[model samples]
Every structure is written in C-alpha cells, then in structure tokens.
Target chain A: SATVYVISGATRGIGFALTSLLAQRDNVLIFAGARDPAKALPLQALAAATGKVIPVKLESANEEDAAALAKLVKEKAGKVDFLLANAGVCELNKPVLSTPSATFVDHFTVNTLGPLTLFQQFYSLLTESSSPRFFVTSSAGGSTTYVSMAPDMDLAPYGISKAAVNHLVAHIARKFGAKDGLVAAVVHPGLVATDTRPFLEAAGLEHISPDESAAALVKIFDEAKRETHGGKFLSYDGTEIPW
Target chain B: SATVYVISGATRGIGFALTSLLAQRDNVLIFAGARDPAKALPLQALAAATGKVIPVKLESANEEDAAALAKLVKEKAGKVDFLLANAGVCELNKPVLSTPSATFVDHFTVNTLGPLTLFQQFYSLLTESSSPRFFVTSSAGGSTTYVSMAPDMDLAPYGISKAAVNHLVAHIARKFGAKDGLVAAVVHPGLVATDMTRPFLISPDESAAALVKIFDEAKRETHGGKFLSYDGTEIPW
Candidate 1:
C-alpha cells in the first residue's frame, strides 16, 4: 500500500526534515511545496537523492499556487493520504497596540488562510484516500491559556491568526471527520531553533532542533485517530493544548 | 455627572437601537458612528431629536475613518467613558469550502479588525475617563463550543472572524484591563432580525434594551474578559 503526502513550506527547517525523513519510508511519495521550487536547493538536493520528492512552487493562500500543485499532484499521484499545512509567515513581531491592522491581515493571509486554502484545494484528493489527515503547524504563541504565562512575548498578530486557524481546524474536523474519514489536527512544533528568534529564555520554553520537532510531529501524525485526535489542538510531544 | 459614549454602525439594526435607547439616558454625550453621516435618516433624526448624539463617519478597519471619529470626539468630548465597537459586516454567509479568501479577509476586517482599530484609536481618549469600558458586539455564531450544535448555518468566514476577535479581546483583557483600568468585554446581541439570515428570534430594540441594562451593571470582577449573552450569562471559550 503506497502513501502519498503533500507538504507546504517544504524548502527549509521542519518542512525539509519532515519530507526528507518521510521520503526514507517504503512506498511513499511526497509533493513538496516551496514558494520557488526551482531555487530551493535543499529540496532540489532531496529530490536528486530520494527520487520520492517532487518540489513544486507554492505561495501560501494564493489560489493559483494551490491549483498548480493540485494539477501536478493529479498527474503524479491520484490521492493524498496526508497534507501538512506548514507554510506560514511571522516577520512582524509587534504587540497589539503598535501593530497595524494591515499587519494582522498580512499575518492572517499567510498563517490562517494558507492552511484553509490548502484544505479546500485538497478536499477531493484527500477524500480519495481511505484515511486522510490534515496536520497544521500551529504555535504555542497561539495558545490563549498559556498566553498569560508568557506575557513577555507579545505576539498578538501571529498568535491571533494561529488561534483562528486552530478554531477552523477543530470545527472542520467535527464537520468532515465522520463523513469523509478525515482526521484534522493542529500541532505546536515546540520551541524550535528555526528562524532564529531573538526571544529564547524570555519565552521560557524548552528549545529543540527542527529535526527533533519534525520527528515528533510525524509520530503524532502516525498515531492520530479520528476518534481521539480529530479536532484536538496538540503539541509535538502529543500532549493536548487548550483550545 | 455626564458620561461620554461612542457607538459604531448606528444606521440601523441593533446598533441603531443601542444608540436610540442610550440617548434617552440623562447627561450622556453619545458619539454615534455611521458610514454615511449625511444620508442616515434614523441616525439623523435621532441626532436632530437629541442634541447629545453626535453622528460621526466611521468605516470599520479603515484608519482614516477611525482617525476622523477620534478627532471629532477629541474636540467635542474630552474623553470617551464607553466605546461600543458595533461596526461589522456579514454579507458573505457561505460555508468554508465555498467561501472565498477575500470573504474571510473582509469579515475579519469589519468584525475583528473593526473592534481592534476602534480600541487602538480610542485607547488614549478611553483612558481619559474615570471608569472607561470597551463593549463589543460579538455573535453566538462565533462560539466554537456551540457550532457543532448548529451545523446547518455554516458560518466559517463570519464565525472565524468572531472567534479571532474573541481571542484577541480575552487576551487584551488580560494584558490591558488591570494595567489601564479598562473594562473590556464582548456580548452576543441575541439572534435579532438584522437583514442577514433566517429564523429571527428578537427585535433590535428588545436586544438593545437588554444589552444596555447588562452593560450598565457590568463590573470588572463580574464581566471583565467575558463573552456574555444579553442576559449576562457567560459564554464558554
């Protein structure tokens, strides 16, 4: 039985590690999504080595980008067993008061609508599989419960987008899980050393490598059941986060 | 003792009723917000009737509109004791899959960013008051706990924006409440007939009357950082 995967933001960091590790598995093919597939050297190198990885150009929340990937996947693989909505943006690191309305919109476009557009685009192909799962790379910064704990890290724009996406995924799971055999869950990848944030100790969270984050996320994805994990907010260690 | 108030989207619907009922109160200066200050008959009539009601132009999430209202309020009233961020739009009432990306953005702009822009613009003026309060008109449709109960109404775009605003307000309450002496809260104006959808439950006046009472009595320890009904029942996050 062959398993097909489609991953967005698959060029660097956790996306790279995830696709690379999954490529080593038997009977597996991954449609890796990069903003500019031709220029992504790491993904290109992975493709050269594995022959199981296909790098495609994908800009998050852009309809045309998703359409192009859908067409490419239709030609290469009939169905997608899993979709990792990993593409997101978080450059604007300001608190709510100073943060512009446009900043929130920009963050929501990439972080919130990115995952939603992926889910909508791949709904049919995902349903084609016997068991399909949509795993989103959510953040602890998005957690409302833990927000009080890390008041030093003022992440309103990014966190609000993540919270909205979290809500959408949970409701979508409830809407689609039983009917389509789809398992949808959002996971926090832990305090990873990717993107090199200035705040480490201020966040007061344990830091791990991107590879470690990806490996743990894969394990969670593997064990995810519609009965247990559907509509749940999860962490890399598979613990539940407050909705 | 006079209290200054600001109400957005006061042209019609619950917002209109909220403005009308509040204007009846003694020694109150209401800075009523309408997109078109010239053409709004109801708001115009109310302004004509009550000299206290100052109709200001407010297009939600537009910085220019917010600045205009802030400027007018700055000149007319030194401080705003209460701000009802009532400006919102829900024209697109489709499901998640069928809904467009722009639709979600539009909803977030009017519903989520709308409240945020108002809060930011009026932060200084609101803090100028002795007991400043920020009241938002949220929706039950935005409730994630209650969405599973009514699957037919598929309000992903509108509901998602509401949910985001809900998260933002709750966190803002945690961040700014004690720090600024501001009481921030959101309320579901009950299912009133607002030319949006089916199955009308209550009239705008009925919803607004109950809301004004709840808001008048709301305190920091009781209602701060809460999602509440018109009757003041707490909504689950």
Candidate 2:
C-alpha cells in the first residue's frame, strides 16, 4: 500500500508544493484538496501532466466538505497515512483592538476551527492507518512568544486563534498520546513567499519562497514519529516553539 | 467503605481550609489538585484530614472538570464521596490589551467552564447518593473577566473570574462526585481575607469553627470535583 497524503489548500502555494514534492517519492499518492473542487482545473491539468495527483474538494471552513473529502479518501484508499491541513487565509491584517470581527471569525473558521473539524471528522480514518501523521501549517505570527517574526503585533485575532490552536494541540496530544499512538504535531512554516506576502511586504514584512518553506517542512515531517514528534509543537526547521 | 474525596484549587486559601480540616477526620476520603498538585495539596490534605484526599486536575490548563469530578466517590466508596476543586485566581493585574489573550482565556474559561457548564450539566444525578454535598459562590467580579477585574492595565481577568470559582465547586462535583460522594466549598464570606493576605488574621479558631463546618458539610454533600474557598478559612472570608 502507498503512503497516502492529504494536503488541503492544494490548489496553490505551499499546498501545491507539497503535492508536487510528495508525488515524486516512491509508493506515494497525493489527495490534493481545494476549496472549489471544480476550480481544481490547474491541479487536474498538473495531474494529467504528472501521474500521481488525485484532486479533491477540501474547504477548510466547511464541515460537509471535510466529511465528503474524508469519505472519498476512505472509500478509495481505505485510510490516509498523513495529513497536512494547509488551507488557511487572512486576507488583510489589522491591529488587535481595531480588527473587524469578521476577520477574526474568518481566521478561526479557516485556520483554527477548520483543522480541528477535519481532525475530528477524519479521526477514525486516521486511526486505521499503520503509521499516521497529522500536522497543521501555522505561522510565527501566531506565537505570542516570538516577537521578531511578527513585530507589527497587528494580527491579534490571527495570533489569538493560533494560540488557541497551540493549546488545543497540547490537549489533543495529552488525550491521544498513549491511546492511539498516532503522530500529531503543529508545525510553523517560516514566512513563505505567497500571494499573501506581497500585502505583508507592502506593510514592510519579509518571507521566503513557498518551495523552500514547503521543502523545509517536508523534511521535518519526514523525520517525525510518535516517540519524538507526536503531540509536539514544532517549527518547519524542527525547532520547538512555546505555546 | 467511606467514599474517596476529590478537590480542586485545594492547595491554598479556602481549598486549603477544607483540606486541612477534612483530612484530620476518620473514615473519610480525599483527593485534591493544584497547578502543582504533585507537591502541594495532596500531601497536606492527606495529613490534615481524616479522609484520603487524592490529587487531580493538575495542568490548570488541561482540566477536564466533568470527567475528574465524575470519578470522585462512587468507585472509591460504596457510596458517593466528597470532591472539591479549589485551585484559583490572583495574578499580574494589568490592562486588557496589556494582558495577553492567552492569560485571559486561561483564567476565564478555567474559572467559568468547570462551574457553570461542566458542573451544571452533571449536577443532578450526583445527588442520587444517600448523602450529597454541593456548593459554589464565586466572586462577583469575574462575572466578566474582560471588564470588571482591571480596566486600565489588562490583567484583572484572573481575579475578576475568581479562579477559585473558575469551575463549579459543589455543583458539578456533587452532580458527578456525589453519586459517589458529597461536594461543597464557599466563596469568601468577607472578601478581603485569604491566603493572599500578608500577615493573616481571622484567627485559626474563629476561621476553623465557621468555615470548616461549612466546607466539611459541602464536601460531605456536594463539592464532588471542583474548587472552592474557605469563606470560613481565608480565600473568601
């Protein structure tokens, strides 16, 4: 059986990079998820161009979408060996006190709650895999302890949501550590140069290439296991970050 | 056999009051938890009370109040036992923004979640016991961590939430622990006196006579798996 990988937000950026990279490995399958299943034309074209990609619909904020995606993967592959919940968006950043509620809600819906919902919905399927791994792509901005990466301190909602996510990660690790023995981690992808970066740059920020960031993350994922990485909060370069 | 006792926020102040008085009794049970439940409340409560008073709900952040509350007495005793989770508030004291969101959340939910929702949802059935205990009177300030505690500096949420009542003391503990035991713990009777006090004055005898009985009764009947204060001991009264 192949090591089946599920990458959400696979239509673009780091998600696409992961799908592309993992596809080249032996006995691997990429179930790429995009918010718009139909809008996956580019991925579909890439799959036609390559041979290892299986495009699917995965809306980070939609439970039904998560369920359907899980159901499809379950029926076809029986289980997914790994999951990278990468579908998140914070279109515009704002100061904590002044940010609109919608922005925060949107971040929660897509970034924090989205992965949790997916984890809950796909929990059973994950258990069926021989050696399963679950990870979420978070950012340095989300960490309260890291001041240099996101000095603006304007992304309060984003930061708060990520902090909550970090706490939840700890709880989940504590809950399932011995029970299931699955590898679960929250990893930060260093500032990836994506569409979102231009906005950050315009606001005077910096980032690395998505490919470089994605590749660094994959290395961390590759080295991870229950004994070492399970239930831990790590960064893409494999460093531990505070909650 | 007597039921096993359980307590939260039991390390100091009001919780310490209940632990000290209760542990000295015979044919009783005991268990307690603190942020540092390992070194603090369990041993002290064990030495003071006649009951066993074990430790639980340590992480402060990882508290699954209902589950811990439910496990209190039934299995430990042929009947339900007492449970109290008295771990609580008092920290920094800053403005809202000045305080981190993480700090507010840790205090607000830890205080509110266990008492109101976690405990209430499981309260009734706990009274099925032959003898049940129940009580919860948290501070009025935490009624809103964001507003009441400290408007200027940003850290009053912990105090306002009165982390002592952060979770339900007797309500859920009795609801869950009581089916197997009783549960109870009071808020400070006077407000200004408690472990946080510098010199400490209510006088041990006056404090003991008034608060211990109430705490003891509450523990016997209601506070199954939550935290409470001395009202009689120090945190509250």
Candidate 3:
C-alpha cells in the first residue's frame, strides 16, 4: 500500500506546496484539508492532474469542522502515513494587552488546540499505519530562545500559542513514539512568506518560500531517527530549537 | 445586591471548603457546582446553615452540565461576581511515556478544556459583573522554575495541563484585564491534599482548608496576579 499524507491548511502556502511536491513521489496519496474545498481551486486542479490529491475541508477553528474532517480521513484513507497539522492563522498579531481575546483564542483554536484535537480524532487511524509521522509547522517566535530577540513584539499571541504547541508536541511524541512506528516533531520553518508575513516584514525580518522550507523540513524528518530525537524540536535547517 | 461566587467541584475537597468558608461572609451568595448534589450531604448541610449557599449540579468534565450551569447562572445572577474553576482530575499522573493519549485527553478535558469551555459559555456574564474575579487552582508542579526542586517527578499530563492553565490564566488576564472591573488570576496552592493530590499524608480536608486560606489571598483587581503562601504572598516568593 502507498503512503498517505493528510495536510491541513492545504489550500495555499506551505501546505499546498508540500502536497504538490509529495504527490509526485512514488505510490503516495495526498488527502489535502482546506477550510473550503469548493474554494480550493488550486488544490482541486492539482488533485485532478495528479490523481493522488483529495481536497477535504479542515477548519482548524471550528470543532465540528475538525471532527467532520477526521471522519472523512477515516473513511477515505483508513490510515494516514503522515499527518501534517499545518492549519493556522495569524491575523490580529499585536501586543498581548491590545489584541482582542478572540484573536488569541482563535490563534490557539487553530494553531495550538487544532492539532491536538485533530490528533485525538485520528489517533486510531494513525496507529493502524505501519509507519506514522506527525508534523507541525511551529515558529521561532514561539521558541523561548528568541523571546529576547523576538522579530516583532506585536505577534505575542501567535508566539505564545506556538510555545504552547511546542509543549504539546513533546508530550505527544512521548505518548506516540512506540516501537511499532510513530514519529512526531515540531519544525520551525524559519519565517515563511504567508499572509501573516507582514508582521515579520514590518519588523525588518525576512522569510523563505514555503516550498523550500517545507521540503527542508520533510527531508530532515525523513532522514532523522526516533530513538535519538523522538520528542526533539528542530528547525527547517535541521537544527535544534530550545524549549 | 451581594457578590456572587461560582465554584465548581464543590461537593467535597477544596471546592466544598471554599463554599463553606466564603459562606460565613455576610451577604455573599455561593453558587456551588458539583457532579451530584444529591450525594453532597456536607455541601447540603453547609448550605442549610448559610442560606447564601445554592447547591447546583455541575459534572465538571461534562460540557452539557457546564452549559446548563452557565445558563442557570446567567438567568439567576445576571452577572457572576467570581468563578473559581477548582474542578479537575489526575487520573494519569504517571510518567509521560507510560501515559496513554487517552489519559492526556481525559485529564485535559477535565483540567484544562472544561474550564475553557465553561469560560466560553459564561464570558458575557463575567464581563457584565461590576467586580468579576476568575481564579483556577493550578499547582506548583506545573512550574518550570521548580523542575529540579522536586525529589521525584512523573506527572507530565497533570503538570503540563496545569502549566497550560497557567498560560490560560495569563491569556485570560491579557484579555479580560483593563476591562472596567475584572480581575483574573491563576492561584497555585503549592501542594494541597485533595482528591487530585498524589497519595500523601495530609488529609484532603486539611488541604481544602489551606486552599481556602490561599483563596483569600486573591487580589481584588490584579490581573496576571498569582496567590500563594499561607501569609497571602505570590508563589516564587
């Protein structure tokens, strides 16, 4: 059986590009999750061309949507080889006090809690797969090392949520990293040029394309061993990230 | 006309004690939430003594119960004066590796997510209160500062969820603070001997008494504040 990759936030940016690249590999299937499958024209087009892509809806903010997405994955793929909880939004990136609580809640709902909730719904399917991997596109802003050197002070909510996600992934890896085959890692994709890139640019920082970053991240995971770094944090360049 | 305090897990332990102690204060109403008030003989007796106490059912981990409680509070209190999210469990306090994912999920459902869902349901009422206070009894085990201080460790699910609650409190303060009369704090009771406590010598009621002592330490309107110590000082004291 071919390996199946389920990528959330797959309508655009890193998710879309990774799904595009992974579809070209031998005996691979891509179950792409976007907020709206009807609006995911690019993904639909890619699926039509590759025959390996199946665009599904996975709204990280909505609990019902996440559950429905889980059901679709269970029914369609039966088991997932690689689960990429890549869905997140960085709107309203501002100081902790000034930003609306809804912004923080939304960021957490999509960025931090979404992955854990998604994992809960799909953990059984993941267990069924011979080789299973869980990946999350965390950020250096969330990295405690960079707090003193935070590229922008405005993105506190995003940074904090990422920090929480970092905490989440380590414990997740501990639980799932078994002999049968389970690998989990949080990859800081440097700074990617996504819709949320304005905060970075405004703060005089640069970001790489998602295609390059995702490729580097996936490659690092493919070559990495579990016994050594099951719950380890790594950057897109394969460097360690501090807690 | 008096202040209203909403407390979860109030049938026994810390929750019960908070209700009992706060009931002594003149003119304050205690909204006590428990999984089964029918079995809460102690809470019932306490309520009978202090006409201010209202025994309400709130299955801490159940969302339907939380939602209904939220609705009832909204209908009755119009605004909640305080919310002490003291309901949680430690069913999986084992080592991180030995712990199953279900254990983490279950702990989170009760310890972390349940409070969150409850907050979602009652945010409006909290905001409406002239002097609303929010407190969740977190633990020192969750503190990264004291990682090496402990003699032994193997409570990742519990510790991590507590740590998350710390962050959740900070998040709540960041959002709810500066609003006219709101105060939210995550008060760490160090090592209280409650049902959630690891097997130890201290009686659970003794722990609840200590918890109430610490609860009194909560500030009137200091967001991002922490209450610790018997003398009413913040932890990391």
Candidate 4:
C-alpha cells in the first residue's frame, strides 16, 4: 500500500520541487495542488512523467476548492499520511504603515487562513491515518527577533501573515496532536531560489536552489519526532526557530 | 502646557479606564476615541466634568476615521506625547480548526491592522513631541511559546492577531524609534476586570495607573522593542 500525501502550492517553487522529489519515492502517492492544473504545464508534464503524482486544482483562500480537494483525497486515498501547507504569497514587501490594508488581508487570507481552513477540511481524513503529520510552510522572516536582527527585511504584510500562521500551527499541534497522535510543525524552508529570486536578489540576499531546499525539507519531515519537533518552528535543516 | 494623549478604543474595557485615568492628570489633555462618541453618555459626561477628555469618533477599521482624528489632533494639540493603540475586539474563543475564516479576519482587522493603520496615520504627529511613545495593549495569550505550555488558553483568532501586533510593534520600534527617538512598547494589561473578562479580573483603575507609570518611565533607548507586563516586568518574545 502506497503512503498518501497532499502538497498544496505544488505548481512551482519549493512546492514543485517537493512534488518532484516525493514523486520519485517508491510506494508514495502525491496529490499536487496547483491554482490551475490545466494551465500548469510543468505540473502536467510532471504528472505524466511520474504516474505517482496527481494534479489537483486548489486555490488556498477558496473554501470550496479546499472542500473539493478534501473530498477527492477522502475518496481516493481514504487517509492522508502527510499534509504540507505550502501555499502562501509575498505581496509588496513594505513597512507596516506603507503597506495597504488590502495587502495584509490578502496575505492573511492566503497564508494564515488558507492553511487553517485546509486543516479543518482535512482533519477527519488525517485522524484516520496511523501516523498523521501536518506541516505549515512558514518563514523565519515572521519572527519578531529575526526582524530585530535584520531591520532591512521589513516585510510587514507577509511577515505578519506568516507570524499568524506560526501561531495557528502551534494551536493545531497542541489542540489536536495531543489526543490523536497527530504531529504538526511549522517549517521555515530557508531562503530558497524560486521564481521570486529576482525579488530576493533585489534585497541582496543569497538563496539555495529549490531542489536543494526541498530535499532538506523532505529529510526533516521524514525524521521529525513528536516530542522534539511538534508545535515548533523549524528550519529546512531542522533547527528550532524562535517564535 | 499639557502632555497630549490619544487613547483609541475608549468606550469600554482597558481603553475607557485608561481614558478616565489620564483625563484626571492636572497637565494632561486626553483625546478619547469611541466608535460612536455622540451616544456615549459616560464619555460625554466625563468630558463635561473633567474639562480634559475630548471624545473623538473613531472606527479602527476605517481609514477615513483615523485620518479625521489625525486632522483633529494636528489642529488642536499640534503634538501627541502618548498614542495608545488600544482599540481591539476579542471575538468568540475557539480552537484553530473550529474557528471560522471571518472570525480571524475580524480579529485581525480590529486587533492587528487597526493599530498598525493608526500608527501610520499618527506617525508624523508622534515625531513632533520631544518624548514620543506608542503603546499597544497586548495579551499573554498571544505568546506562542507561552500558549504551547498551557493549551487550555486557546484563543486562536485573538492570540494570532496579538502575535502579529507584537511583531508590528517590534517592526515599528526598530523602524521609527531608532531614527526619531520614538519609544514604542507592547504591554500586556494583566487580565483586567471589564466587560471582556472571564478570568483574572484585576481592577481596571489599578491596571491603568500601573500602565501610565510604565509609559512615563519608559525611555526610547531602554524600553523600545520590549514587551512589558502591566507590573513592568519584561515578557519573553
């Protein structure tokens, strides 16, 4: 029997790389969530190349889309072994005041509430698994102390949304993980080279390629211990991050 | 010759108490912000009796209201010494999975973005004073590390918003305080007794007095970017 997994934001960047890496594993089935599977040529090609990978249309902020995916996963896999909440956006990296209210709303919608709603939709299916794990793709940029050390990294809207997601991850881990043997953790995938490299480069920051980042992340996911890593913010290399 | 202060969320809870306390100071002018100031008889009566508390219409989510308040403050006081971004709402307390998306949005709007937007609108006026301070009333529940130990206090929406605000406070302190001598701190008001209390209800008067003392004693160099408890102890980030 194959191990079932669902990776949201799976069309590109770290999500795509994780999909590629996970699909290569024997006896592993992956449901890759993209905003538009028909339009995502790489995802389509990947799906064709690796029969283990299935493309699913998912918009992180849309409740109906989350429900649809939940329904599909329930019917197809029956239980989810690993759920990766990687769908997030970084829009207009500006100061707190300069950043528009709509920007914060959009970021919170996609980054925080999106993952939260997905967890809600998938909770029952997750509980059915013998060893269920839920992971939220978070950022060190969300840390108040991290920002204090690097003031120039003033990504207010995205940072705040990611911060909220970190708290949400903790909330889920404590509330659900204790009772059902569900292991939940938030991971800061480090500075990875994605389509957003131009923006990263503009900030004069260096980043590892997505493949390398994804590989490290998968390693962390496989090795995570409930007592050690559950409810904690971890780096791609699996070190603890300050809240 | 008065130290001008603006306290938002002044209709009830900690904000209202802080408003009443500050209005009593001999050389203090308080701008009390309520969503509907005209109908708030207590606020109006306080204004009439104290001759210091000015009730200003303020809706935390509305930019126009923030701007209008800013305009009024600029024309009247010219410089604000203390800006308490205290207007916030705690909706239903539910676990993360059980909570609705709208609940999170509402909490973030009133608790997180409201204060950030207020700081933005009043940034210039805060710079005008010789000793400028920005304080946000935060909660211990927002502490990620704190909540991890005590899972029973699961306030998902309110906790997350306050956590974001803590980050915002740090961001603002770093951005503005270093450059312009603007002192900014987020204070946990220590579970005060008001309409919102369910447990650990301390006297609102005592909490406000302690907070005022904390604000008075805070120096930009020392207190900037730190989260302080109502008793003036440092909170772990």
Best by TM-score: 4
lDDT of 2 by residue, B1-237 (tens): 554445556655555556566666777666565655446634554555443666555433343544554555434553343434444545554443134434544554555343433234234434555655545434433322122112222334444344224222322232334244544444543343234221112544455456556654654433333333445332311
User: Sorted by TM-score, highest first, which candidate order results?
Assistant: 4, 1, 3, 2
Q: What TM-score number comes out for model 1?
A: 0.93
Indicate the docking level reached by candidate 4.
medium
* Alpha-carbon local distance difference test for all models: 0.82, 0.57, 0.68, 0.84
Model 2, position B218, has a per-residue lDDT of 57
Ranking by DockQ: 4, 1, 3, 2
| Candidate 1 per-residue lDDT over residues A76-189, each given as its tens digit | 888899999888776544778898888899989999999999998888889888999999998877766565456635678888888889878877887898898899989999
lDDT of 1 at B108: 90
Per-residue lDDT for A1-243 in model 4, tens only? Answer: 678889999987888999999998889989999899889888888888888998999888788988999899888889998999889898645767677898888989999988988899889989988888999889898987776788556578888888888888888888887787888989989887766788786655747888998999999889877888888889987578898
Per-residue accuracy of model 1 over B145-183 as CA lDDT, tens digit each: 665556545668877888788878877787778788678
* Clashes within 3 Å, all models in order: 0, 76, 0, 0
Error of 1 at B224 (Å): 2.3
Q: What is the TM-score of chain A alone in each candidate?
A: 0.94, 0.92, 0.91, 0.96
- What DockQ values do the models have? 0.54, 0.02, 0.09, 0.77
Chain B of candidate 3 versus the native chain B: what TM-score?
Answer: 0.85
lDDT, model 1, position A73: 81
Interface RMSD of each: 1.8, 17.1, 6.4, 1.1
Question: What's the CA error at residue B188 for candidate 3, in Å?
Answer: 5.0
